[PDB]
């Protein structure tokens, strides 16, 4: 959700930035928030509303 | 003369120009610049055409 500045890259010879973030539609209404899964200690995808 | 011989190492030999502080007091001095991001290769050949 918060975007992330991971590291830099070159574009037409300039240092610019690379940003990681959820696509628009999976962060618009607070249900889209549940749509997100986190891996747990024994290897399994838990949802957010858990 | 003494070093003109070498066919394996260009060797300039010259006096410093009087006010060292100022580097190279003769002729002229310019940079060619990649403005529209054209790249090192194009730039390199602009140098060489020039």
Swiss-Prot record, chain B:
Gene inactivation effect: Disruption of MexA, MexB and OprM significantly reduces active efflux of N-(3-oxododecanoyl) homoserine lactone/3-oxo-C12-HSL/PAI-1, but not N-butyryl homoserine lactone/C4-HSL/PAI-2.
Subcellular location(s) per record: Cell inner membrane
Query: Do you know what upregulates this one?
Result: By growth under severe iron limitation.
- Coiled-coil-forming residues are none
Q: Where is the signal peptide?
A: none
Spell out the subunit comment: Component of the MexAB-OprM multidrug efflux complex, composed of six MexA subunits forming a hexameric tube, binding to a MexB trimer, which interact with the trimeric OprM outer membrane channel protein. OprM is thought to not directly contact MexB; instead, MexA joins MexB and OprM by forming a funnel-like hexamer anchored to the inner membrane. MexA may initially form a hexameric ring complex with MexB prior to OprM, then OprM undergoes a conformational change as it contacts MexA, allowing the periplasmic gate to open.
> Extra info from the record?
Pyridopyrimidine derivatives, such as ABI-PP, are not exported by the MexAB-OprM efflux pump, bind tightly to a MexB hydrophobic pocket and so potentiate the activities of antibiotics such as erythromycin.
| Protein task | The inner membrane transporter component of the MexAB-OprM efflux system that confers multidrug resistance. Functions as the major efflux pump for n-hexane and p-xylene efflux. Has been shown in one study to be involved in the active efflux of the autoinducer N-(3-oxododecanoyl) homoserine lactone, thereby playing an indirect role in quorum-sensing; but has been shown in another study not to be involved in efflux of this autoinducer. Over-expression of the pump increases antibiotic and solvent efflux capacities. Implicated in the secretion of the siderophore pyoverdine.
Family named by the database record = Belongs to the resistance-nodulation-cell division (RND) (TC 2.A.6) family.
Q: Specify the protein name.
A: Multidrug resistance protein MexB
Please give the organism: Pseudomonas aeruginosa (strain ATCC 15692 / DSM 22644 / CIP 104116 / JCM 14847 / LMG 12228 / 1C / PRS 101 / PAO1)
High-level lineage: Bacteria, Pseudomonadati, Pseudomonadota, Gammaproteobacteria, Pseudomonadales
Gene symbol here is mexB
Q: Which residues of the full protein are shown?
A: 653 to 702 of 1046
